[PDB]
Amino acid sequence: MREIVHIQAGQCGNQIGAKFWEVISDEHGIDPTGSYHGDSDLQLERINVYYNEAAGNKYVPRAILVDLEPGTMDSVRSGPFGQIFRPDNFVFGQSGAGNNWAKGHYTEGAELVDSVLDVVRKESESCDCLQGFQLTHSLGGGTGSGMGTLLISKIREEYPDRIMNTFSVVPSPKVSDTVVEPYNATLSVHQLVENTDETYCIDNEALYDICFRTLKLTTPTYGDLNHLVSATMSGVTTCLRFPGQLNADLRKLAVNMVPFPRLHFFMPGFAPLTSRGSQQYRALTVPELTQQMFDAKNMMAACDPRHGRYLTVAAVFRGRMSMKEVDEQMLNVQNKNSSYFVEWIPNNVKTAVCDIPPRGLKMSATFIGNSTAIQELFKRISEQFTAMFRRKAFLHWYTGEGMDEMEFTEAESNMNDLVSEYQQYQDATAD
Amino acid sequence: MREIVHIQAGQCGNQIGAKFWEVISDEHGIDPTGSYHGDSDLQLERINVYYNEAAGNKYVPRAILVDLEPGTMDSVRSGPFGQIFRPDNFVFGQSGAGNNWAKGHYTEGAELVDSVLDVVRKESESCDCLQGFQLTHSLGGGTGSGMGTLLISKIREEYPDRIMNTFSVVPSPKVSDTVVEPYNATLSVHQLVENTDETYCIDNEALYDICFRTLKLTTPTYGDLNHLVSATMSGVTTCLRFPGQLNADLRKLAVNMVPFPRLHFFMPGFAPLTSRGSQQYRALTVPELTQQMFDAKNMMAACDPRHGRYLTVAAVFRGRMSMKEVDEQMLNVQNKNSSYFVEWIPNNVKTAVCDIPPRGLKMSATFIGNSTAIQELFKRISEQFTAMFRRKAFLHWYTGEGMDEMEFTEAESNMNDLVSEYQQYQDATAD
Amino acid sequence: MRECISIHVGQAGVQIGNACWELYCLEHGIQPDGQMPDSFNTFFSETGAGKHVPRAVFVDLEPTVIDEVRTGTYRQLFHPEQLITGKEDAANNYARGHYTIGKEIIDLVLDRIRKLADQCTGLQGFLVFHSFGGGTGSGFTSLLMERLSVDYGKKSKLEFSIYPAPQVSTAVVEPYNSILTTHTTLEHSDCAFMVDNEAIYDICRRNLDIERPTYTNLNRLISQIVSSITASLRFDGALNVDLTEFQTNLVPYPRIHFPLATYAPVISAEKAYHEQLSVAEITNACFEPANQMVKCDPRHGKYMACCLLYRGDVVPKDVNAAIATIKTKRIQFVDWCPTGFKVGINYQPPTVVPGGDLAKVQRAVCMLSNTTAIAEAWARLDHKFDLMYAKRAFVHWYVGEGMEEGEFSEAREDMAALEKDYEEVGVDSVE
Amino acid sequence: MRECISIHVGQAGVQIGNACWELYCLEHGIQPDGQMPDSFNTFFSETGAGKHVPRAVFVDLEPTVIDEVRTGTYRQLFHPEQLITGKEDAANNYARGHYTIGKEIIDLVLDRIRKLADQCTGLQGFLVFHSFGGGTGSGFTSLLMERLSVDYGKKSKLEFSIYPAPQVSTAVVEPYNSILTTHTTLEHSDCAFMVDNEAIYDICRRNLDIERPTYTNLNRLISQIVSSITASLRFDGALNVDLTEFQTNLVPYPRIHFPLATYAPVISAEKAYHEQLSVAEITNACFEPANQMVKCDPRHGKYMACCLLYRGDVVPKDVNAAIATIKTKRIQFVDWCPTGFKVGINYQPPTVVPGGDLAKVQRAVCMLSNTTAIAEAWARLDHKFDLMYAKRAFVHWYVGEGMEEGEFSEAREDMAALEKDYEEVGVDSVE
Numbered sequence A, B: 001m002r003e004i005v006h007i008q009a010g011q012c013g014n015q016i017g018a019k020f021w022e023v024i025s026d027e028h029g030i031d032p033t034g035s036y037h038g039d040s041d042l043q044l045e046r047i048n049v050y051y052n053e054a055a056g057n058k059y060v061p062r063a064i065l066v067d068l069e070p071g072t073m074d075s076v077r078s079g080p081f082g083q084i085f086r087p088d089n090f091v092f093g094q095s096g097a098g099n100n101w102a103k104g105h106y107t108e109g110a111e112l113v114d115s116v117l118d119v120v121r122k123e124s125e126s127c128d129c130l131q132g133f134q135l136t137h138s139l140g141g142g143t144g145s146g147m148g149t150l151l152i153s154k155i156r157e158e159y160p161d162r163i164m165n166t167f168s169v170v171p172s173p174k175v176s177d178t179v180v181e182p183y184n185a186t187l188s189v190h191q192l193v194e195n196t197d198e199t200y201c202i203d204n205e206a207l208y209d210i211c212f213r214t215l216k217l218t219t220p221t222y223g224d225l226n227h228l229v230s231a232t233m234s235g236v237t238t239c240l241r242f243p244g245q246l247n248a249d250l251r252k253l254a255v256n257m258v259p260f261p262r263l264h265f266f267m268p269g270f271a272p273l274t275s276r277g278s279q280q281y282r283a284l285t286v287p288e289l290t291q292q293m294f295d296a297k298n299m300m301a302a303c304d305p306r307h308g309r310y311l312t313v314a315a316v317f318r319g320r321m322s323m324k325e326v327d328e329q330m331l332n333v334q335n336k337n338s339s340y341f342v343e344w345i346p347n348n349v350k351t352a353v354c355d356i357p358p359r360g361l362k363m364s365a366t367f368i369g370n371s372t373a374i375q376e377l378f379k380r381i382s383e384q385f386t387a388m389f390r391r392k393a394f395l396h397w398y399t400g401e402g403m404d405e406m407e408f409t410e411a412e413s414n415m416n417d418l419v420s421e422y423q424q425y426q427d428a429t430a431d
Numbered sequence C, D: 001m002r003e004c005i006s007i008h009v010g011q012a013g014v015q016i017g018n019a020c021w022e023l024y025c026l027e028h029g030i031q032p033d034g035q036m037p038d039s040f041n042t043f044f045s046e047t048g049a050g051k052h053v054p055r056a057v058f059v060d061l062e063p064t065v066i067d068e069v070r071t072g073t074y075r076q077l078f079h080p081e082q083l084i085t086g087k088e089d090a091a092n093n094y095a096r097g098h099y100t101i102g103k104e105i106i107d108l109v110l111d112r113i114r115k116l117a118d119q120c121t122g123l124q125g126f127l128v129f130h131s132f133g134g135g136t137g138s139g140f141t142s143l144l145m146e147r148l149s150v151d152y153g154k155k156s157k158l159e160f161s162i163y164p165a166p167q168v169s170t171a172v173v174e175p176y177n178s179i180l181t182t183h184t185t186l187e188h189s190d191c192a193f194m195v196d197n198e199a200i201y202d203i204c205r206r207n208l209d210i211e212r213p214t215y216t217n218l219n220r221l222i223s224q225i226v227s228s229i230t231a232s233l234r235f236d237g238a239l240n241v242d243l244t245e246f247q248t249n250l251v252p253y254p255r256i257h258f259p260l261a262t263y264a265p266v267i268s269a270e271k272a273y274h275e276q277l278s279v280a281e282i283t284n285a286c287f288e289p290a291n292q293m294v295k296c297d298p299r300h301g302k303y304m305a306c307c308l309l310y311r312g313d314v315v316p317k318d319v320n321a322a323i324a325t326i327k328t329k330r331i332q333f334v335d336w337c338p339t340g341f342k343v344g345i346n347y348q349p350p351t352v353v354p355g356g357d358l359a360k361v362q363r364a365v366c367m368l369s370n371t372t373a374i375a376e377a378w379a380r381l382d383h384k385f386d387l388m389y390a391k392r393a394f395v396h397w398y399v400g401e402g403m404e405e406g407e408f409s410e411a412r413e414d415m416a417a418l419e420k421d422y423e424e425v426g427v428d429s430v431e
């Protein structure tokens, strides 16, 4: 079998991860004590992908939780599934870093990481075929970005041939919930780009819109938001955990989604998301699903794909459905809206099918889009970045941590070039 | 199969539609929950014409309800069949437009429509063969006319080859229930003419007369009035929903009813309308029905066909009857009263027969007349229009919405020419 | 073996077909399930299980009609692919039937036909059923014939058609569609058989002594005629007449090929008991204007050729005697003809359909008649056309479907010539 | 005895194999436990207890697929070592399949094969199943063939392959992998059989008259084809055809060896009851473009060679007659050929798999066809390649696995030549 290491970093990362593991355990019949009470042999058969059968019937999700300070991971341990985790996988310091990327990637993180990695190594040692790593982190967070970035680099150093992917939480185009976002985010990306093999962009902003609209919710609690995200994450690796018709290994996804290194940012989506108040007025067909999947309004990343083109799209389906329906339906999309796809690439769609549906959803699908419209995000960031940077805003909170100002200019350089790259391909033509 | 999209617009439109759907659901054995409890396989077999089998046994009438403000559609949702509709098909704003056509077709409607159409598109996407569109709206209404007109234009833009028909409520020759009728109505017609393929004219005034007289009613409640109208509407599409001897597709009706584009206004009728107090003194024969159908007093449009000629008449029968009876009887009408028919056209009658009677009426028929006498209506309107317009009455409530005064003069121009056209054909002769 | 392919087009064509095949089964003892609990290989093929499969193709752009068949009693008698349906009908628009809609179906139809034809050991010809005026019947058939004549230039092309009776209704745009079809029909059809619904009603009233007839028994009468013709192939007779011989014995000049038809002795059992239906009696009845299936008083013109088909208990010599008497009856014949009578005799008497309204007889006569009197009908038609065309009523419906306005002129021109042809024939050629 | 070794590579290869062996067992009465409660020694070996063990090797770097087999119904039919699995798949990367991953498995595979081959008394050849585009199928097979041809330079090397259908999806990097494989395949394979999933869907829709098909029955159709071929070895026939003879009778020029395939008569029981599937009937069906298993309208090119395999109730003379007719059908053949028909006849009629969607017939025809029309498909493929290669999309995924960039150029070059070859063949050689 192939194994995945799940690393969680930062308050956000840990909170998301907590929900993630809840979801995964649920799907495999694992209760809060780590005891197996599933119904299908499949649940157990390939459980190895995530859990390490410790002893008896106790399974221990191979996850590592990291934070610079307590009060977060603590709450995780106090929660429903706190006891499912092995204590020794909780690695944290006793200092904060109020969204101080420098601290997270230097003066504080440099100490903490000395541990962390040791645990990582141990976990990788227990694996038979290390599929890769998953990092749940939030951009802009002193830990999430600081440590996140650091760890990524350090891991590739020792596992250059493994697939690394992360589910980053990006900056919001609307109200920012931090002050020094631009800086932290930019600094992270500066290195992220040159490391992680693929990364997903999820924006709370977009998620709120979905909730208030599509889900008809009025109290979009972070727990609910995380739940939604978790669902997406689980979909991504369903192909590893369960049998299907067209299994798509994590690596495979990278191959059909990244055309050029560096250009590996994705917009995630998910269907169906019908509110309970209207579920009875649905059909739940392959067409219905694709309607949602390609609906700009269901993009979990706060960008409007309508203004860009897709370099490539992956569609992973779960449950039951015909091959005919899927393929034909996906074709129709490309044909009807050909202007939204990059002419350089014939067949801009990768599909996959697993025979195991989400609990309660006979049909479900995830959407991974590599749209050039993501450029927009980076553009926004760069603009905000230079606005602050040229005024030297708050730079003393980075300089004071031993950060060289030049690092910022380098970071910008990478960022701007990223934008340029997308812009070039955006309108580059075959002839 | 072929599918029809039912759009309802304005308070009136929605109230009528509510009754309409009640009627239709009844005929197909659909209860208020959308569950099928019919007796004949026919009821279900071709249910697709209107309902979209959502899931299980729940059918969802493919209708779209539109209004500029709540308090109307709300009451619909609070009614008997409110739950039969899919919530997502209720599109409305939060602003009124006190019979302000300009608002409905500009400053307010221009915002609302951006949504609406999206829903329309979705509904059309779910269809296999989009027969066309039906719009239930009221002339003179800020929404009904304003949005109505707008939507019609917008739809043709994307569905130029579909049949669009509406069931407009026209101005009354007697007491007007609005102040700025002439304006709103004229402005609507100005565009209506150049869009909608066929439209029906129903006048509350006439309906009241029928009720007090023929139906021997004393409390003609709008619900009852709407019921009557609904019956007519259902008759029109019975040929699509049910088998018969001479099925007449919606398109077919247009073909045999419109001799020249623009000239597509019709006077609807219905038989039998015998009051319960005297139903036992009836025969219910094909002759009886035609007596009612060609009785000027049973015209649902407030015009007196006696003063004009028929360009063409469609007669749709439901239930059981012989072909012999029908054809011969219709012939007799043309022969006996040949002066009332336009000599240009041999055989001024189109007939159709469906084998499925209305609930409780073994024999029933609808009447669609293209009479030149409709000219009268337009004449009245134009006269009233210029009376107000020349005094600049209330124009500031349109000018203030960004309406160009020239639009009124153009509207009049179209109106007057419409009248002229009818007048020409009215007395134009073969030699 | 002598084989024949029937083609049923449009509401009428199909619905008539229903009656026909119902009858065919009865006569050959074939049960609805294709079972026969030695003259079948003309209209029926044998499957692996021995099951009989009638040889016909049903085409109707209006799936409703065929659905009735698909769900009807004889749904087991058709190979699914013999029932070809469209999604939208021709709305009484020749142009739709010919140019824009039928165009997209005809390919399928012909392919199916070809495959059917390829099962034959010796195809005699085709029997096409349609109605003038029907967008499908009229329009589509035009197209069909155009292409059938290419592949099968030497096969007999017989057709039966409902000729818009002088004083009936149903559709308004009839004379347009009618002429448009005729214009092309003349160049491909070998012989058309005209039938008026109007005339039939009269017969039902006076001969059957019934009232209130529908297509459910009007068609039954028609099917008797059809049977009478094909009985020649299906049963041994004293004088069998192959389909090919109908050209020779009816047409005397290419462009003229519209025989009228009749059928004696129509009669209710009530009168049957009181009347001796002798050969002579029946023969005389066939020439009584009242009994023609076409509203055309034969006395207005002269006969060009008659063909008599006797079934059942007849005696050659008696037949001859009867005919001689007919010749004596100073009934006029053109000088171009010296004989005028070709007679077939089939031993198989007429049958009777359970629940029918026609008494069973020991002998019957079907007569086909080519007469100049029909010119009247053509004139009437042309006249109606002229009136509508002058103002260009409904023309935009055809032009909008790609029809050329000049095409109407063309058709009319040819029709004028046709009428003239009849005039010339009846000139009474003399030195 | 004539023996044959089957090899199943990758998701498709294996999953198809499942269907195949399922079928083989059925036809020979072999029960899932290898039990037979005299033509088996071709695909099956006898163990000490008499138990049957099919002769095939399953290879898939993605253990998931094989695990399904290992835990499936037929888990008792395989000698553990016949099920060879890897730890990580090729991620749609030819380079992984060929150079970096497959490299480490191939040794095992070949050894196993050798041992299997050593059980044979006379190996006819191999049947390799794979898909173009599949990293394993495409990449690994390339490697496999490269080495099989060394040890067994004189054995027949047949393969079946899924040819990335013109308008479908599944993977993005297809055309890369496809061409890369083709480039090497041409130098080792004796004859490849092209199958399109796309085409099959069409067949399911139109012939089977079904909807929503999956690989669970798409493969079943394919297995019928495979059976038809090997039936020659497995059962006595009037004209048995050894595998070797397929080279001679299909290939006329080394580099060209991509026959298309079809299979008649696909059909649902519904229609079976209404249709006589004669020899001639079926034979004709095989040449109807619609029924090809490859999206390539054969009329675009000419035929080079056809091979017909009849099963069941057929009569040599009838077969000959049918073919003669086909020759008459002015279906074009290259001047280089004067015959073009090699025919096999096997007495063993087709069978039917319980729970399948295909009606059982008394006779069937499998056709293999070498045609120049396929050049079109090759052109399409090459074109797609060019577009992606130009920008070097996804190239880094191959280069990172040790592939030489120039290697792509090389492959493309050869493909150009291949296309050219077809052009030259269809030149219509004339003095």
Ligand SMILES: CC[C@H](/C=C(/C)[C@@H]1C[C@@H](OC)C[C@H](O)C(C)(C)[C@@]2(O)O[C@@H](C[C@@H](OC)[C@H](O)C(=O)O1)C[C@@H](OC)[C@H]2O)CO
Binding pocket: A290, A291, A293, A294, A295, A296, A297, A305, A306, A333, A337, A340, B117, B118, B119, B120, B121, B122, B125
């Ligand atoms: C294909 C990828 C994709 C890009 C486009 C343009 C796609 C195309 C189609 O979906 C596949 C639209 C679709 O067919 C519909 C019309 C039914 C519909 O869904 O369109 C949207 C608006 C549309 O954007 C205008 C949407 O937001 C969107 O994203 O559309 C309103 C919605 O109200 C119910 C409904 O009317 C991005 O992932």
Ligand SMILES: CC[C@H](/C=C(/C)[C@@H]1C[C@@H](OC)C[C@H](O)C(C)(C)[C@@]2(O)O[C@@H](C[C@@H](OC)[C@H](O)C(=O)O1)C[C@@H](OC)[C@H]2O)CO
Binding pocket: B290, B291, B293, B294, B295, B296, B297, B305, B306, B333, B337, B340
């Ligand atoms: C034919 C189309 C038609 C036009 C005419 C003129 C038609 C002709 C006939 O109906 C078909 C009249 C009819 O045969 C009657 C005499 C039995 C009768 O019904 O006539 C009306 C008055 C008449 O107008 C005078 C009516 O209103 C009307 O519309 O009549 C009183 C009524 O009291 C019971 C009764 O006496 C318009 O659709």
Ligand SMILES: Nc1nc2c(ncn2[C@@H]2O[C@H](COP(=O)(O)OP(=O)(O)OP(=O)(O)O)[C@@H](O)[C@H]2O)c(=O)[nH]1
Binding pocket: B245, B246, C009, C010, C011, C012, C013, C015, C016, C061, C062, C089, C090, C091, C092, C093, C130, C131, C132, C133, C134, C135, C136, C137, C138, C162, C164, C169, C170, C171, C197, C215, C218, C219
């Ligand atoms: N005798 C007879 N006449 C019929 C029947 N059905 C329709 N007609 C006549 O046929 C003519 C109308 O043509 P239809 O066949 O109904 O039209 P269609 O071919 O279906 O064409 P569209 O409906 O226009 O697509 C009228 O003259 C009708 O009276 C029938 O069952 N029997």
Ligand SMILES: Nc1nc2c(ncn2[C@@H]2O[C@H](COP(=O)(O)OP(=O)(O)OP(=O)(O)O)[C@@H](O)[C@H]2O)c(=O)[nH]1
Binding pocket: A245, A246, D009, D010, D011, D012, D013, D015, D016, D061, D062, D089, D090, D091, D092, D093, D130, D131, D132, D133, D134, D135, D136, D137, D138, D162, D164, D169, D170, D171, D197, D215, D218, D219
């Ligand atoms: N007909 C058919 N086609 C299949 C099946 N499975 C996969 N395919 C097709 O095969 C192609 C994909 O190759 P796969 O065989 O799935 O890939 P693989 O060989 O497992 O290689 P990797 O997964 O890349 O290691 C696509 O064109 C699929 O549509 C199957 O069971 N039947």
Ligand SMILES: Nc1nc2c(ncn2[C@@H]2O[C@H](COP(=O)(O)OP(=O)(O)O)[C@@H](O)[C@H]2O)c(=O)[nH]1
Binding pocket: A009, A010, A011, A012, A013, A015, A016, A097, A098, A099, A138, A139, A140, A141, A142, A143, A144, A145, A169, A177, A204, A222, A225, A226
């Ligand atoms: N979706 C989501 N976002 C979160 C959550 N908790 C914090 N955030 C977001 O993460 C960012 C703040 O970073 P955080 O992880 O708390 O800081 P850190 O501990 O220094 O990494 C902000 O954009 C928050 O909106 C969560 O549970 N879910």
Ligand SMILES: Nc1nc2c(ncn2[C@@H]2O[C@H](COP(=O)(O)OP(=O)(O)O)[C@@H](O)[C@H]2O)c(=O)[nH]1
Binding pocket: B009, B010, B011, B012, B013, B015, B016, B097, B098, B099, B138, B139, B140, B141, B142, B143, B144, B145, B169, B177, B204, B222, B225, B226
């Ligand atoms: N027949 C009928 N007419 C109505 C109904 N409700 C309103 N009306 C008429 O519609 C016109 C007023 O327009 P309304 O639809 O209420 O205004 P809107 O909401 O701005 O479109 C008047 O002529 C009313 O008599 C109804 O339920 N039935």
Ligand SMILES: [Mg+2]
Binding pocket: C010, C011, C060, C062, C089, C134, C136
């Ligand atoms: Mg019709």
Ligand SMILES: [Mg+2]
Binding pocket: D010, D011, D060, D062, D089, D134, D136
């Ligand atoms: Mg695989």
